Structure formats: C-alpha cells, structure tokens
Amino acid sequence: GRRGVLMTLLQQSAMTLPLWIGKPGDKPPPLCGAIPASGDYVARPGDKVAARVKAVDGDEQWILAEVVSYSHATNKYEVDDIDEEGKERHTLSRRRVIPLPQWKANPETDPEALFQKEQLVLALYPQTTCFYRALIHAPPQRPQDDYSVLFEDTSYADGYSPPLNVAQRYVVACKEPK
Amino acid sequence: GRRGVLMTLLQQSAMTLPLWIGKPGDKPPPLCGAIPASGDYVARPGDKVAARVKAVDGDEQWILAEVVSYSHATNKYEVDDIDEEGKERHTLSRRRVIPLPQWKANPETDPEALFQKEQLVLALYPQTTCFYRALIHAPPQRPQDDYSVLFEDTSYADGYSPPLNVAQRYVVACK
Amino acid sequence: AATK
Amino acid sequence: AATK
C-alpha cells in the first residue's frame, strides 16, 4: 500500500545520496556524512531533515520531514511530515531540526566524516519514518554500506536491539535526551 | 621549574572550563563536551586546540596549543605551543587542528554530550602536553570529575594502560 | 509519521 | 611540548 511504497522511496533516497569526492589535504564539507551543519545554517525547501515534533500531550518524537520554508523573524521552519498523511505540516524552532547529510562519506577516503563505534546517534528505525536513540555498532567499511546500530529498546533485558542496518542518510547527531 | 609551571597552567585551564548550564528545552552547544564543532568552524585567537605538528625529523604528534590567527587567504591557522620551550609558531591546515571543548558537559543534566564508554578518543596523557589514542573507560559522574581512559600502550601485554584520569578540556574525538 |  |  502507501506505506510500502514510501519505504521503497526512502530506501531509494538513501541509495542515490551522492558520495563526497574531496581532493588531497582537505576537510569534508558540512553535511558530508557525520560532519555537522555550518553554525548558522538554514536548510533549503525540499531538503530532508530530522524534525522534533511535540505532540499535543507533550510527547516528543524526532521524525523524517521535508523543509517547506524558514523565517529569520521567528527563527522557525515549516516542515512536512514525509508520510504526507492527513495534516503533514509543522511549524517549529530551528533547534528542533537537524538537516540530513547531503553526501555519503566514503569510508576509504573520509573516515573522519563517519560516526564511530559506540557513538550515541539518532537513527531512523527500519521500516519507520521516526528517529530514535542508538549506539553505533559499526561504521560502513565500503562506500555503499549502512551503519550497523544498536537501538535503545527496553523490550530486551539489556536494553538494546540486535545490530540493525541504517543508511548514512538516516543517521544524525543525537540531539535527544534519555 | 618549567615543568611544574607547565603542569600548573595545564591543570588550571582544565578547571576553569565553564560548565554548560541550560534550561529546559536547551540543547548543549557545539564544543560543549563531546559535541563536535560546526562544519566550517574556525577557532578564535586565544582558543585552545589539539594540533597535529610534524617535528623537524618528521615525527607526528597532537600537541596542546593555542590559536594565534587564521588566514582566509590560505585557509591556515597559526598556533602557539602552550609550552614556553615550544618556540615555533606552526602553520597548519584545518585538518591538523581540533578545537578543544569550550564547556564541560554536566553528567547530571546533559549526559548525551559526554563520550560513551569504549569510544575511541584523543586524550592528553598525564604529565605531558600531547594527545594520544585512548578508549573511554568511564565518563565523569559529577561535573567536577575527569574522564577515566585506557590509553593504547604497547608496553602492556593487552595493549592498554590502566585507567588514567583526563579532564573534559583534554578529550576530543579520534580521528 | 510511521512509528515503531 | 612535553611528550610521552
């Protein structure tokens, strides 16, 4: 149905993410893999982001969304919930938005642009459009490889999932408290 | 003595590091604890950094250092060794310079801005002004506390030092 | 959003 | 600098 097609789309979006190709002696650019955005950065309409949506009852959830607009008067974005189901638009502060990477980091050329083993991240849970807290189990070793992550998961006695695969496009800095 | 003076200065810069004190809703900023600098950040004059310096013989070391200037013309820093006996002002590419934290993360309010157990870091080795590869052994329990770390050390049969204490100012991400 |  |  609509959900399965969306997942196909999101998998495709992750695959088509261009690899960053630097030249010798440089630093990988902001939004290459794990490299944070520049200090006063604003994402472009159409850019994908992780957006922290506060439900009416106060529950906080990081979701995948697409930027619609921004205003420096308020320092706020409009974003659209990527599943586009029902009422998809949300107005939220810039600190509630993490831009997704615009390149994959190539593990061969730029390992400094990858999250490392044991690092705390927010990662898109497979077959969802929601980000949750996780630890890196393994960075990709090859250009096309996912991160392997351990999601925090209280349904396991030791509080962690088995290693799950999440693409570079869908792993970002952990801006979520425990 | 020069050694005592250097050690004091070191020890003092560590405990002057401000504690990040946010209120509900605030996230810890770039350079608070383990939170990395922003993507095109340029360190300011007077800022402390870890700098990858190549001696006259070619030997590579991450040293404790202070920014003097940055030139946008060539995209290079000038940095001073924190050690008076380090008489050379080095010209360094951005990739050779890691800004040190500008706040301590409080474990009681912002644990997500601390390095996790088993994370690989560059940490200042005790009685030196140089950074070396190490694994996090334990985060600080309290705002005043050091990290405990295991340095890679081929003089041990298992490849690691015993736990050693390193302050938040002196622990950065590897590589 | 599609949740876990 | 003081090294190891």
**Do residues A97 and A77 make contact, with C-beta atoms less than 8 angstroms apart?**
yes
- Render chain A in DSSP notation, one character per residue: -HHHHHHHHHHHHHHHSPBP---TT--PPTTBTTPPPPTT--PPTT-EEEEEEEPTTS-EEEEEEEEEEEETTTTEEEEEETT--SS-EEEEEGGGEEEPPSBB--TTT-GGGSPPTT-EEEEEPTTSSEEEEEEEEE--SSTTPPEEEEEB-TTSTTSBPPPEEE-GGGEEE-----
> Residue B123: enclosing H or E segment and its boundaries?
strand B120-124
Which pair of tokens denotes residue A115? Answer: 């999250």
Q: Outline where DSSP puts E strands in B28-108.
A: 48-54, 60-71, 76-81, 89-93, 97-99
Surface of C (1-4) touching A: CB under 8 A: 1-4
Instruction: Dihedral sign for Cα A50, A63, A115, A17, please.
Output: negative
Residue of A133, A169, A147 lying closest to A60 (CA atoms) = A133
Closest-CA residue in chain B for D3? B128
Q: Could you tell me whether strands B164-166 and A97-99 are parallel, antiparallel, or unpaired per DSSP bridges?
A: unpaired
Q: Å resolution of this model?
A: 1.8
DSSP B103: B
Query: By what technique were these coordinates determined?
Result: X-ray
- What is the C-alpha separation between A148 and D3, in angstroms, rounded? 37
Please report how many Cα atoms fall inside a 13 Å half-sphere around the Cα of residue A130, on the Cβ side.
Answer: 12
Q: Is B38 within 8 Å of chain A by CB?
A: yes
**Which residue reads 């002057």 in tokens?**
B16
**Do residues B61 and B130 make contact, with C-beta atoms less than 8 angstroms apart?**
yes
- What is the C-alpha separation between A66 and A12, in angstroms, rounded? 16
The phi and psi torsions of A4 (rounded to 5 degrees) equal -65, -35
**Do residues B96 and B24 make contact, with C-beta atoms less than 8 angstroms apart?**
no
- What is the C-alpha separation between A20 and B100, in angstroms, rounded? 26
Give chain A positions within 8 Å (CB) of C3.
61, 128, 130
**Which residue reads 């644990």 in tokens?**
B111
CA distance D3 to chain B (A): 5
**Which residue reads 């497979």 in tokens?**
A126
Which pair of tokens denotes residue B96? Answer: 């050779």
Which pair of tokens denotes residue A139? Answer: 């960075």
- What is the C-alpha separation between B141 and B107, in angstroms, rounded? 6
> Residue B6: enclosing H or E segment and its boundaries?
helix B2-16
CB–CB contacts below 8 A, B to D = 25
- How many residues are there in chain D? 4
**Do residues B49 and B31 make contact, with C-beta atoms less than 8 angstroms apart?**
no
Burial class (CB in 10 A: 0-12, 13-18, 19+), C3: exposed
Residue-range domains of chain A with CATH: 47-104 (no CATH), 105-178 (2.30.30.140)
Amino acid at A154: T
Residue of A118, A116, A98, A114 lying closest to A106 (CA atoms) = A114
Residue of B12, B19, B11, B13 lying closest to B113 (CA atoms) = B19
Burial class (CB in 10 A: 0-12, 13-18, 19+), A9: exposed
- What is the C-alpha separation between B152 and B133, in angstroms, rounded? 6
**Which residue reads 């261009």 in tokens?**
A18
Among the partner residues A64, A81, A128, nearest to C4 by beta-carbon distance? A128
